[PDB]
Structure formats: C-alpha cells, structure tokens
Write a protein that binds this ligand. Structure first.
Ligand SMILES: [Cl-]
Ligand SMILES: [Cl-]
Ligand SMILES: [Cl-]
Ligand SMILES: [Fe+3]
Ligand SMILES: [Fe+3]
Ligand SMILES: [Zn+2]
Length: 296
C-alpha cells in the first residue's frame, strides 16, 4: 500500500527531513515541493541532501515519491512572454532536480488562460511542454485534474487529453487524479467511481494515472471550489475515499493526502495525516478523528 501525504521540504535537512516526517506519520510514500510552493527560488541539487534522504527512505521503507511544481507556474499564459518563459525554464530545472531526487513524476497544474480562452491556453501549454521536454531525462509531467475555479485549464478529462495529444510525447506525460478536484468539477467519484474510470479509460487511459491525490471536499459535487476536507468529514465521504484508496486500478500508484490541518487557533494547527492513514489502513471511519488530531 503506497500511501502518504504532502510533507515539508525545507531547512538544512531538506529531503532528509521530508523522509523523517513521512516515517513519523506512518507513510510509505510522500510528495514534496522542491522549495517554497509559491515561488521559483530553488537550492542547488547538492543542498537538497538527497543521499542522506535516500538513506532514511531505505531505512523506513519509503519509495515512489512525488514532486509537485510550484502553484505559480503558468505555461498557458499567452500574453506575458516572461511568465511563459519563466515557467518553461523552471520546469526544465525541476525535471533535472526530480531526476536526481528519483521521483518518477512532477505534478503540474496545467495552467490558467486568464482571458485568452481555454483552447488558446491549451495551445500554449502544448507549446511550453514541447520546449520543457528536451529529452535529457525520464521524469514525467503529471498533469493534475483541476476543480474548475477561475480560468484553470484541466477541469475535464477531454482538456487533459487535448494537451497530451498535442504534445505527442506520451511517455513523458501522465495524469495526477485528485479526488477533491474531480468531485468538485462534477465527476461522480462518490457514487460511480468505476464509471468515472471507464470514462477516463475512453478519453485518456487509466494506465496513465501515475499519482493519486486523496482529499475529501468541503463542497457538493460540481461546485468547482477546490476546498479540501479531512477524509470522511466532507461530501465525498469515507466509504468512497476508502474504496478509491484500495482500488485495484491504483495498485503500485502513490496515493497522497493533501487534507487540511486541524485546530481551533491557527497557532495550534496539527497535521492529520498519521491518523487519517491509520483510518484508511483499518478501513473504518473514526468520527473522533479531528478531536484526536488535536490531542497528539
Ligand atoms: Cl499501492
Ligand atoms: Cl528532459
Ligand atoms: Cl455531493
Ligand atoms: Fe496540486
Ligand atoms: Fe491535488
Ligand atoms: Zn486542490
């Protein structure tokens, strides 16, 4: 069972600290940004502390880790060449870092068309990915299913398919399937998940899902809000999320929790991952989970 969460990548320890945190929460995989999620400033590969990080992963049985590109990348921007070029340049270096880290996939929000229209944005994403994928490496770009807020591209499987077919470099592309996003976009992952996968197989191919993000949602299906909720406390519910986590189609695919911290005061927020993972592994919902997280 490859089950983990987002973990921090910071300080002097960097990847070593990430692996320590993942083991602390009982994880067998984890996801990291290579630095701050909201900027493109990045440390050297040497400073990422990869050798020691790998040592800790070997010690604790962690594998199949995932990288997420910063949220501010927008290679769909057709008006500002500098934003497009920064995104392309950054992802080229991110591929190099990820190849050194040993992750197979970088999760990328496809982009936002910011008024040019979805199809102009898709055309620009294709252009950008063709420049990013210079063939020096095996790391894939895993396009994330998006919830559909604002001018985000990727709310539907068809949009992702149009990007993939446009790039025409299929072994360098994959999909990250986020349960909150697909639910918020309108897919019936709560009550007809196998039907959603059948549609996905027709349009993209389920074999191309290489990362799964496991999130409940604060909103009902189709609301397009992208507000994550702890497992079982939102509108998707535990029965559906547990089914997805254990689904045979996602065997050997990392499942990554991105659920919110719990707590009354922002000063006293605590991570829910250790207890959510225990709940998923035991396949039984615990209504006291949020009160227990506040007690750790
Ligand atoms: Cl698995
Ligand atoms: Cl490359
Ligand atoms: Cl719903
Ligand atoms: Fe994401
Ligand atoms: Fe996600
Ligand atoms: Zn989200």
């Amino acid at each position: 069972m490859l089950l983990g969460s987002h973990v921090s990548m910071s300080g002097k320890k960097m990847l070593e600290g990430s692996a320590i945190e993942a083991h602390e929460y009982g994880e067998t995989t984890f996801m990291i940004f290579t630095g701050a999620p909201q900027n493109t400033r990045r440390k050297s590969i040497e400073d990422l502390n990869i050798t020691k990080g790998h040592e800790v992963m070997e010690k604790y049985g962690l594998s199949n880790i995932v990288v997420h590109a910063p949220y501010i990348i927008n290679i769909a921007n057709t008006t500002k060449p500098e934003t497009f070029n920064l995104g392309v340049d950054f992802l080229q270096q991110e591929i190099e870092r990820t190849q050194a880290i040993g992750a197979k996939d970088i999760v990328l929000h496809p982009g936002a068309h910011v008024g040019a229209g979805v199809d102009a944005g898709i055309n620009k994403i294709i252009e950008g990915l063709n420049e990013v994928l210079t063939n020096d490496n095996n790391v894939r770009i895993a396009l994330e299913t998006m919830a559909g807020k604002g001018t985000e591209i990727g709310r539907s499987f068809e949009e992702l398919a149009r990007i993939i077919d446009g790039v025409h470099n299929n072994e360098r592309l994959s999909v990250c399937f986020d349960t909150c996003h697909t639910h918020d976009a309108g897919y019936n992952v709560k009550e007809d998940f196998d039907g959603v996968l059948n549609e996905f197989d027709k349009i993209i191919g389920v074999d191309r899902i290489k990362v799964v993000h496991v999130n409940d949602s604060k909103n009902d299906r189709g609301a397009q809000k992208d507000r994550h909720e702890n497992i079982g406390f939102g509108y998707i519910g535990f029965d559906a999320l547990n089914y997805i986590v254990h689904h045979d189609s996602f065997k050997d695919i990392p499942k990554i929790l991105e659920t919110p911290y719990v707590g009354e005061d922002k000063k006293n927020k605590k991570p829910p991952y250790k207890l959510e993972i225990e709940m998923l592994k035991q396949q039984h919902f615990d209504p006291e989970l949020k009160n227990k997280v506040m007690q750790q």
